[PDB]
Amino acid sequence: QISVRGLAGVENVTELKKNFNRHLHFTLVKDRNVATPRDYYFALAHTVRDHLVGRWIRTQQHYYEKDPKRIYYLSLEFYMGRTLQNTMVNLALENACDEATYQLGLDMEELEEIEEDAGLGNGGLGRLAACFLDSMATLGLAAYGYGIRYEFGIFNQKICGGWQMEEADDWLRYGNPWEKARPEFTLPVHFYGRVEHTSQGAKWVDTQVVLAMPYDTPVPGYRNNVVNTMRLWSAKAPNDFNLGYIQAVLDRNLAENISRVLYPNDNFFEGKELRLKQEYFVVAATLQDIIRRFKSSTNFDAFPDKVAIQLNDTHPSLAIPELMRVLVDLERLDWDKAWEVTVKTCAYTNHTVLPEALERWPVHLLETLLPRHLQIIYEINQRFLNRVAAAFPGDVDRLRRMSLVEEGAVKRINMAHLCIAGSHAVNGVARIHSEILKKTIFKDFYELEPHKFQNKTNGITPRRWLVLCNPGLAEIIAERIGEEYISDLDQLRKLLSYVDDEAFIRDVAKVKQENKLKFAAYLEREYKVHINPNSLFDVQVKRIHEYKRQLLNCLHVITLYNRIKKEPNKFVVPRTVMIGGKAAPGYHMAKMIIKLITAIGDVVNHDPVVGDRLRVIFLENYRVSLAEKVIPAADLSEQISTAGTEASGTGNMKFMLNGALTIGTMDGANVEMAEEAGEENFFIFGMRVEDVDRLDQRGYNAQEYYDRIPELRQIIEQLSSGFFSPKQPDLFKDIVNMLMHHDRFKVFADYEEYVKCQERVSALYKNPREWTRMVIRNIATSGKFSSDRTIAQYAREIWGVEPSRQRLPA
Amino acid sequence: QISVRGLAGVENVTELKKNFNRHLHFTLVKDRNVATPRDYYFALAHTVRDHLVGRWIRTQQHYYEKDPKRIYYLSLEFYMGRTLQNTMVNLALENACDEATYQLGLDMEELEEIEEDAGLGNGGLGRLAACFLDSMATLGLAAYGYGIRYEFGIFNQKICGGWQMEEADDWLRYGNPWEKARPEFTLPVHFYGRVEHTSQGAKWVDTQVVLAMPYDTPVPGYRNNVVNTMRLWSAKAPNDFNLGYIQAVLDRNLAENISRVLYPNDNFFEGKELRLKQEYFVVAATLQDIIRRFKSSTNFDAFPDKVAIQLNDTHPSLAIPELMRVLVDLERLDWDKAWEVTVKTCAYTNHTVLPEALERWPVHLLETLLPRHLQIIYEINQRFLNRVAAAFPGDVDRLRRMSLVEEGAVKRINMAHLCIAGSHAVNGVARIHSEILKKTIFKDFYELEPHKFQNKTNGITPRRWLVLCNPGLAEIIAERIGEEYISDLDQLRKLLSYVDDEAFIRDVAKVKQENKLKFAAYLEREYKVHINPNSLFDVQVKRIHEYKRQLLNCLHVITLYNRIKKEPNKFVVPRTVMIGGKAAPGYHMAKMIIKLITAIGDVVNHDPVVGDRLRVIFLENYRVSLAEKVIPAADLSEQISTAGTEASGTGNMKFMLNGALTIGTMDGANVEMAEEAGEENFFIFGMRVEDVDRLDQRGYNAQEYYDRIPELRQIIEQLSSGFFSPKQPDLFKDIVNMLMHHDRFKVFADYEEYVKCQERVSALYKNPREWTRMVIRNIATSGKFSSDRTIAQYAREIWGVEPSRQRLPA
Ligand SMILES: O=C(N[C@@H]1O[C@H](CO)[C@@H](O)[C@H](O)[C@H]1O)c1ccc(-c2ccccc2)cc1
Ligand SMILES: O=C(N[C@@H]1O[C@H](CO)[C@@H](O)[C@H](O)[C@H]1O)c1ccc(-c2ccccc2)cc1
Ligand SMILES: *Cc1c(COP(=O)(O)O)cnc(C)c1O
Ligand SMILES: *Cc1c(COP(=O)(O)O)cnc(C)c1O
C-alpha cells in the first residue's frame, strides 16, 4: 500500500500464506472452520518469528567468531509493548504480510490488536530500556538486555465509578510466541547463609538456592539482519526444596514468587524484601552468564576490554559487590585488582531527582539476606572514605555525606553512592538533569572525581515511535526526502525547506486529521464515548504523580469551564482534553487525582451550555500500545512538571516526532527540545529551576496566590464546596489541603502563566496554516532525540565501541 | 530392522530427516554445533507429533458429523509414561524414524531415554486408565479421557542410606511437546458460598471462582488413523482475584495449588480439603464440557443415548450430585427425570477392598466447600432409603448399613454408596473381586439391585506392553503367526502348536536372554551394580504395601541366604532377586520394608561365601518406563498378595505376556490367569480366600507359626538381634512386632507353602527346555488379558456402543 512498509513480492506473499496455513494446521492444531481470530494472530506471529530465526542464529554466531566487546544492559524493567508489528517493520515484511493475510480474508490490523503488551515496566525508565535495545541492534552492537521475566507486568487499570481499580496483567495466559525458554542454561542463585572466614579467605555457606531459568527474546535491528537477545530470568525451585510431602511441594511457590510480579511504583522506593530478592536474582544469574561467556573467548585484566555492564539506575547496583565477590572469593584475585576490573566494567545511569526515589536499603535486610555482600559493601566504603579523607583533609562533614552507610535510627546503604564509587561513568538523562547531579545531589562526588560525570540525553526509537505508529506521516516525509531518515533521524532537518510548500503543509495537516478521526473512532468502539474530531486534542499521558502536575492541567480545565459558563455565547477554540495514566496502588494522592479528573468530566461533558466545545476524557489503561494510538492523534503535548523534577521525559519526544506542539516548563529534555526547534516554536511557560530555588529560600505560601487570583479562588471554593462531588461534598478536601498547605510542586505558582500560555495555543490553533508550519519546524528538528544518537554516545563515550550501520549477510 | 516396526521407505526417511532439521532450526532455534541430545529428542518429538495432527483433526471432525455416543472416562489418575515410542508404534513410524535418525548420526534409543514419564498416577488404577485410552482409540470409540494436569506427578524416589527419599517430579520443566493448551475453552468452577432458596428453586451464591484451563493430548489408536483426546484441566486464578496489591497477586497461588500435585497414596484414603477440591475441580469442568458438546449435536431424555460417564473409582463420584445440580438447579428439570438421566449416564468401577481405601468425606468439609452438593446428597439418600424400606420392611439395620450418611463422632458421606445408588452399573476388576463385592462388601446393594453388578476383568495394552517394550519377542511371534495378534491378542493361542518346535523354543529363550543381558547392562551404566545374567531373575515390582507382602519375599530371600550359609558347598540355582516400588510418604511401615530390603542386600551381596549365587537389588524409582525395561527381562513374576486383597492386579498380566512364569496366590486376576494357562503351568501356593476366612474366625496367632517352623524362628531372631542392622540393633523391631502381633495380612501363614513352591520353581529352572515350554503355554494363553477385550466388554455391556476395527481414511 505505502512505500515505507516494503515490497509485497509475488513469491514473498505466496510463501507467507503457505507458512501461515502450515502453522495454523501443525502449530495451532486448528482448521479454518474452528479458528478464532486469536489463532489467526498466533499463526501470523509464528510465521513472522520464522523469519527472525536464521538471522538470530547467524548474529550470535558472528559475535562468537568476531569476539567484539559485549554490552550488558541490566534493568529491572523492559517496557517492550507488542512485538509483531515491530518485527515486521524491522524485517521489511509489513506490506507482504498485509497482502498475504488480506488474500486469506483477514485484516492484519485486527490480528495485531489481539497481542498482549509485554508490560514489564512502569514508565519512562522501562521504555528507555526497550528503545535502547532497538537502537543497539540497529547500530550493530553486541548487546544483551538482561532482566526478570515477570509473570505479571504493570497491572491493568480499570476505572470503576471514576476510581482506579487494579487487576493482574496475566500477559502469558495464552503463551508468548516470541520467547524461547533455555532451561539448559539454568543457574543457581544463593540467598541467606552466613560467612565463614578460613585460611583461603571468606566462604558464603548454608545458603538457600533458587534457580534462574533464562528465556530469550529476539531483538531485531532495522533492516540490517542483526538480531540481538533480551534474556529474562524466571525463578524455579530446586527439586530437593523442602524435601509433610504435599506441603513441601506447595511451598515451592515461595521461591518462585521472586519473578512473580513487577513492583508498580514510579519514582518511589519501597524497601521490601521481595524487591531486594528480585534485584539480587537478576544480578547473580546475569553475572554468572557474563563470566561464562567471557571464559569462552585466568586473565581478568582483559575483562573490561570484553565486557561493559550498564546499570539502569541503582536497581541492579548489587552487580558491583557481586562482581567483587566472584573475583575475590571465587576467582581469588586480590582486592585492588578486582576493584580496578569492577570500576572499568560498570557504569551507572541516574534517572532520579526526588529523594524518595533513591534506594536506601536497611542494613538489617542486607545482613540477613546477603551477609557477604554487606561485608564487601563496608570494605568498599572504608577504602572509598580513605580517599575522600586524603583529598579533603579535615572535612568531617563530607565524610558523613559521602558515606555509603547512612547513620540514623535504622542504618541504611545508599545504593547511588555505591554506584558512583564502583562505576567509571555516571550519567544523567538530560543536560539540565546531569547538571543538577553535578551542582547539588552528587556535588561532593563530582568534586572528588569530575571525570566520572557525563550527560547522555535520552531518546526514542523512530521505528516504533514514527514508522510503526504513524505510517502516514512517515510516508509523506519519505515522499520528499527518502527512507534514510528512519535510521538517521538528523536527516529530518531537510524538511525545513518544505515549511512554505503548500502541498506539504496540506499533507502534514491531513495525516493529523486522519489520525484524529482514527483515534476518535477507537474511543467510540472500545469505550463508547463521542468526541468532536475538529477540536484541539490536548493530551497529557504519563504516570500519575504530583510532580508531573496533572493537577495544574485540571485547574486549567476548570478555568475554561468557568469562563464558558460566565460568557456562554462567546467563541472559544474547542478542546478535547485527554489525560491518562496509572497511579501506583499505594499512592493515595495519585488515586485522588484520577478521581478528580473523572469527576470534572462528569460535570463538564454533560453540561448542555458547554456543548462539544469542551470535553474531558480519562484515557483508561495507558500503556505502550495505547501511546501508539493516542500520540499520533495529539495536537498539544502537556509536559508541565515543576522545573527540576522531570529528569528527562521521553513522552515529550514522542509527541514532537508525531506532529504535536508542546506546552511545557523548562524541565528535563523540554529545554533541549526548545533549543533544537527555537523557543518561538514551543509554548514555554512557568518558573525556571532558579525561580523555584528563590521561592524555596523565602518559603512557598500558596495562600498568597489564592488571595491574588480570583479565578483560582473560585476553583478552590468549587472543589471545597462539593461542586464536583455533589453526593460527597468533602471528597476532595485532601487535594485542597495539599494545594493550600503541603504542595511540594508549587502548582499555584505556575497557574497564571500556564492559563495565559494556554490562550496563546488557542490563538495559534485558529490559524491552521501557521499551526501546521510550526509543527513542521518541530518535526524537522526532532532528530537529536533519536535513541540512535543517544546509544552512539553511550558507545563512544562510555562503552568504548564503534557503532556500525553495515548489514550482516541475509 | 525388524518387521513389526513398519516400513522405512525412501520417501518417508527423506521427509522425516528434512522435518527434523526444520524443527531443530525453527522450533528449537539451534544449529547442529550447539545442539544438546535434549534438543535432538525435541526435534524428533515435534517431527512425530506432526504426523498426529491431521488424523487428530479429522477424527474430531468425524465424531461431529457421525455424532456417535460419546464415552467420558473420568479419572484423577492417568499413568501415561512416555509418549514418543508409543506414538511411533501406533503410526507405523518406528523403523522410518530409526533409519532417519541413524542417517543424521543419532541413536533413537538414546533420544527416547531423555523423555520424562507423565507420572500422573500411583499405580494400577492410573495405569489402567492409560491402557484403556489406548484400547478405546484402537477400537474406534468416541472416547475422552478427563483428568487433572498435575504440575508434579508421583514423586521421584531416591534411595539414601537404604531409605526412600522423595523429590518433586518436575516433569514439565523442559516443556511437554505432546500437549496443546486450549485457553479458549476455559471454564469457571465454584467453591464455598451458600444456598439461597427462592420461588424458582435453589441458588448457589457467593462462591469463589477458580478457572479450569484444558490441555489436550492426542491418543492414537493402533494403525487405524484414529486419534482420540485426553483433556487435562489446569487451575488458574481469575484476574480480579483478591483485587495490598503485591500480596493479592502472590495469593493467586492458593487457587492454582488445586492442580499442583498428585496425592501419592496407594489404597489409602486421606480426607484432606485440597484433595476434595481436586475431585470437584475435575468433575465441574468436565461436566460443563460434556453438556456443551451435547447441546451442539432442551431435551435431556436423549442425554444417556449420547453420553456415558465412567467413574474410575469414587474419586470423581461428585459427578453424580453435580449432574443433578446442573439438571435441577440450572436446566430446571424435575428431580425424578434428572435422576433417571443421571443413573443411565453414570457407571462406577470399584478397585478396592481394604476399608481404609474407601472415601468417606466428613460432612463438615462438604458443608463448607460444596453446600449445595451436600443437600443433593441428603435428598438422594432419603429417596434411596425409602426404596430400601419398601423392599425390606422392618430391616432397620439394613437402613443404617446402606445409608450414604455414616453416623459416628464425625458424620461422613460414603462415596461408594453414592456411586452404587447413582449408577446403572457397578463393576469389579476381576472375577473373584466382583464376587467379593456381591457376597460381602456391597451384599445389601446387590440384594436390592442385582442387575447393577457386573465383572469386567482388567487387561493391559499389548502395544506398550509387548510391541513397544519387547520388540524381539513380538517379532518371533510375528514370524510364525503374523501381525494381526497385536490388535487381536486371542490369536496368541496359535502359538500352542509351536510348544514342541525346537526353533521356536530356542528363539523364545534367546529373546529372554537378550533382554536379561540388556537389563543387566542398564543396571551397570545407570546404577553401578553387577549382576550375573545366567541367574534366575526373580522380580517383584509394584507399590510398597503390607497387603502385597514384599515382606513374604524378604523372608524367602533370608531363608535362601541361611540355607547357603548352612551348606555352602551345595548347588543352588542362582537368583537375582529384584524388588522395586515406591512407598507413600506417610506410610511408615512401607518405608521400613524398603529399608529392610536394602539392609538384606547389604549382608547378602557382600558375603564372599554366597558368591554370585544370590543377589538382592532394590530397583530405584519404579515407574512406567522402568517397568518397560525390567518386565521383559524377568523370569519369575512375584504376585503374592494375601488372598482377597489384590482386586485384580495388572503387573501380573504384563509379566505373563513377556515370558515370565508366575509364583502367586489365588488372588485377583491370578485366578483367571491360572485358569487360562492351566494350573500346572502356574506356581500357585498359599491360602485361598476361604482359608483366610477360616483363620479369621478362629483368630490369627502368628506365634504358632514361629513355634513350629525353625527356619522362620531363626529369621525373626536375626531381625530382632540386629543381624541385618549391626549399628542399630533394634532398627527393625517395629517389623518384628507387626509380624508377631498385628499382621492383618498373615505373612507367616503362607511362609511354609511359599518356600516349598519356590523350590519347585528352582527345580524347573534347572531344565531350560521345560522352563521355556511352560513359558510358551503362558504367552500363548495371555490373550484374554488384552485391554481390548476388557474395553469391548465395557462397550457392549455398560456403554451400549459397538467397537470397530475399521480404519478412518489417512
Ligand atoms: O521511570 C522512571 N524514571 C524516569 O526515567 C526516564 C528515562 O530516563 C526519564 O525520562 C524520566 O524523567 C524519569 O522519571 C523510574 C525511576 C525510578 C523508579 C524506581 C523503582 C523502584 C524503586 C525506586 C524508584 C521507577 C521509575
Ligand atoms: O491403584 C489402585 N488400585 C489398583 O487398581 C488396579 C486397577 O483396577 C488393580 O489391578 C489393583 O488390584 C488395585 O490395587 C488405587 C486405588 C485407590 C486409590 C486411592 C486414592 C485416593 C484415595 C483412596 C484410594 C489409589 C490407588
Ligand atoms: C514514553 C512512555 C512513558 C514515559 O513518558 P513520560 O511522559 O516521559 O513520563 C510512560 N508510559 C508509556 C506507556 C510510554 O510509551
Ligand atoms: C502395571 C504397573 C503397576 C501396577 O502393578 P500391580 O503389580 O498390579 O500393582 C504399577 N506401577 C507401574 C509403573 C506399572 O507399569
Author numbering:
A (entry chain A), B (entry chain A): 12 to 254, 261 to 314, 324 to 836
Direct quotes from the study:
GP senses plasma levels of glucose to ensure that glycogenolysis is halted when glucose is abundant in plasma.
However, the two compounds bind significantly different at the enzyme active site and the biphenyl moieties point to different directions as a result of their meta and para connection, respectively. Structural comparison of the rmGPb-4 complex with the rmGPb-2 complex reveals that although the glucopyranose atoms are at almost identical positions at the active site C1′ shifts by ~0.4 Å to best orient the biphenyl moiety (there is a 47° inclination between the phenyl rings of 2 and 4) and hence the hydrogen bond of N1 to the main chain carbonyl oxygen of His377 is lost (distance in the rmGPb-4 complex, 4.2 Å). Furthermore, despite the fact that the two terminal phenyl groups of 3 and 4 are inclined by ~15° to each other, both are involved in cation-π stacking interactions to the imidazole ring of His341.
